[PDB]
Every structure is written in structure tokens, then in C-alpha cells.
Amino acid sequence: MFLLEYTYWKIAAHLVNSGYGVIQAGESDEIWLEAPDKSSHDLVRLYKHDLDFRQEMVRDIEEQAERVERVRHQLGRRRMKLLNVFFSTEAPVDDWEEIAKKTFEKGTVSVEPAIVRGTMLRDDLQAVFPSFRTEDCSEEHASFENAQMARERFLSLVLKQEEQRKTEAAVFQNGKLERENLYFQ
Template identity: 30%
Template sequence: MNGKMELLFWQLVYFFIKQRYRIIQMSNHSHEIWLESLENKHVPIVRVVRYDIDWSQWLKRDMEYAWRIAEQIQKRRIRRFREIVNIYVSTYPPVDDWEFLIEKPLPLSQKRNAVFRTFLIHSGNVNMSLQQLTEIVQTPIVLPTVVNDIDPFFEAERLKQDILREAREQHERERRLFEYGKPVFTYIFIALQVLVFLLMEWSGGSTNPAVLIQYGAKFNPLIQEGEWWRFFTPIFLHIGFLHLLMNTFALYYLGMTVERLYGSWRFFFIYLIAGFFGTVGSFLFTTSLSAGASGAIFGLFGALLYFGTVYRHLFFQTIGTNIIGLIIINLLFGIMVPGIDNAGHIGGLIGGFLASGIVHLPNHLDWKRQVRTLLVTVSAAALGLYIGF
């Protein structure tokens, strides 16, 4: 094994990490590393491989293997991109013909004009390959010089340990983000809505309009007469057992995630503000009697979307695609099925996003952004109430 090429491999990985790429997959022996960036729109995925290639047949098989993985990766990406780059670092090139394999990039079937491009860097073409790679990633690739009397194997091992340590620390930081708080208000809100449901059933039935109005359902004429608390009380009321069951399950699963992300008091604020905006949306666009936690629950979707604006890479790496898909499905379901208060859902979604921007994420204060969001939230609420009254 050539020490200089081993060092070059780790220098390349280090370069991409400094360009805000993150390791998403690594082989057991650390000789195959996939990196991802949500900031580089042209080349979001890079694969770097350290292997001394003897024959072009091995290169062909491995390119086919990597292309299939690239196909799977790009399917989950929403944003458009131009290329996925595949880099081999080999002491010498294959002994037989190989240039034709990498001469033209391979097309990726799911993305228009997106390609899978391969580079083979060996001891005879390092400078030329780095120049070509610079043109693709659109960032000058400048590798640190190494003093001649330093063992390249030693330097490569040192750089490797630094990279692996940073990757572990990054993983630990990301894991702690999802474990900041312990669910408290999620259980309290679930218990409260179940208790209110039982009281409503005891008082004459949760589907009885008179009972719903008595317990604080959204009823436009009474809100216009000054019963402002009806912007909040519908959050805890449900019309029928199935309505309660569906919203309780949704609150449990979404609430646990959001409360762990934001902490209990931020979650409390987000949930109530989202519920308020959901009721305002329903108040503005529907005159029917309504109740339910759906607006507040959509606000939890909004809180997760806000998390995605702060940690885009982590959002799409974990829950992002599923969350966006669920929001779209639920909104389409509300459009197609009569009797569903979609205005309340959209209002809650907006309210949850704005409320999350006000409190922001724990340990990540951004006062200017938070103040701007507060002003937008107050303005939106005031405008909605002005129109409604």
C-alpha cells in the first residue's frame, strides 16, 4: 500500500468535511466513505474509495454497485442536483484499458440531466484529476502540504482519527437534539382531552351540538359576541370516539417527538399557539360548529418543518421526507372528504411553524430571527381577528 495515496484519500475526505459535507456511510475498514451536503446544490453526494485497482473488470463492477446505491439515494432527495461524484484513489491505474469506463458520466434515471460521474486518481494523474474535480465541485481543492521527513502513513492515520472522532461527535450532537426534553405536556394534553370527552359524554354526548357549545366548541356567533376563549377551548374537545382516538394517536406520536426536540415549555407554547391559529383559520373560512385538536396537531407538523429549516441535512436524513408526505396526504384527504375543517388544519400548520420560530430550538438562540417571527405572528393573528370581527 502506498503511503502517499493513503494520505491523499484522507485529505480528500477531510476537504469535503470542511466544505460542510457529512459522512452518511462508511465501510468497516473505512476505505469506502459516502458524504452528503445539502448546501452544495450541484454535487450533494460524494463517494471516496481507497483501493489499489488491478483490473478494469473490478472497476466496472464497483461502479455499477455504486451507481445502484446512488439511484437509491437520489430517490429520497426532493431538491434538484446536477451530479453525484464517485472518486477512486489507487496507487496505479488498472493494467488493462479502463479510461472508456469513466470517460462519460452515467445518467441517473429519476432525475433529469443528473449524472453519476467517476474519477480515478492514481500516482500519475493527481494534479490533473484534482483540477478536473475542482471544476465539478466548483470549489478549489487545496490539500495541505506534508513535510518530506514525516511518514505519510503516520500522517494519514492521524488525519483518519481526527475525521472519525469528528464524525462520532457529530453523531452524538445530532442524537442529543432528539433527546433534549422529556414528554410531560404530551401526556397532560392527552389526559385532558380524554377527561373532557368523558365529561361531554356524561353531559349528553360529544356529538350533541348543545353539549359542544356548552363546553366551548368553535361557534362563530358566540365568538363574535366576545367569547374569545373559544379560540382555545376547541383544542380539547372531540366529536365522537373515532375523532378522539385518531387525534390522540397523532398527538402521542407527534407530541413525543416535538416535545423531545423543543422541551416541555416550548412544546406547550407551540401547541397552544397552533391550536389558536387553527381555530382562527376555521373561524375565518367556515361557519359550522367545530372542535378538535387537529389544528394544534398540524402545528406539531409545522414545528418539525421549522426544525428542518435549521437542520436541513438532519431533517431530510431522518424524518423530513415522511413528514412532508404526511402533511400532503392529510391536506389532500381534507380536500376530498367532506366535513373536514382544512382551514383549521392549514391555520394550525402555519401557527405551529411561527410559534416554533418565536421560541426557536433549545441552545440555538437567534434573537433577530425570533423577534421578526414574533412580529409576523402578532401581525397575522391581528389581521385574522380584524377580518373575522
């Protein structure tokens, strides 16, 4: 029952409802979503974990990349790319910003780390997932207790998605954001 846990299930819902294929869905801490665009990113991992130090933050990626090496084999790609989004109540107390500014590459794996922290969550969440509406995470609905209901809604949602993708074939809208920023010195 956590505030981030509510958001974690709500993002899983929005992604699968946006056509992302659920590679692995059931765990209360980790969900894998196949990128339907089959863009430079192959998959997205939602990970509900609180991080004290940037040490643990980088350490997670070391494991993620080895997990991804297994996926690379079945994907047949020359490189595998994972977007990994941590869902944490707060950001690590030191140097974590360097981590979000660096692509973790290990062998033929590339990982894009991201972390949404409760401290600025409404802005942070749409920065990573602009496909998610902040109105859907209204303060009056985003509570520690509501996280329980969020799981239930998600479980009914993934089944509803089966019907949704049938009507989805009649595409009638497109859009883009083109949010670029980078950094330099």
C-alpha cells in the same frame, strides 16, 4: 497504512470542513459526503480501492448506482447524481481513460466516475478537488505511516467542524475556477 489512505482521510477532512454533510463516516474505505450546494451533484463518495482492470472499474459503478437508487428515494429528485472518486495507487492497466470520459447512467441515476492515482497524485487530486491545497499533502508529510495520524486528525476535525460552521455563517469570501476542457474528435 497506505499513501492513498493518507490522502483519503485528508480529503474527507477538507470536504466536511467545506460544509459537506457526512452522510456516512467511519469506514476505512468508503465515506459519503452530501453536496452542500445541492447542485446537479447530490453527493460525493470517496472510495479507497486499487483497480487492476477497467472491468472492475465499471463494475463498481454498477453497484454504486443501485446503492444510489435507495438514496434517490429519500432525496425525492427526478434524477440522482453521485461523484465517485476512487483512490488508487495506480490506474487500471488498460482502457480506464474511456471510463473517466463517460457518465454512467442507470435508470434515473447518473454517476460521474473519477480516479486519483498515486502516480501523478499531486496534480490529479487538485484536478478533482481544487478546494484541497497540494501544500497540505506535502511529500514530507504524505507517508504510509502518516495515514494512521490522518484518520485521527480527521476524527478530531469532524468534531471541530461543529464549531467552525457557527463562525462560517459570517461569510466574507467567494471564488470559482471555471475549469472546462471536454474532448471532441
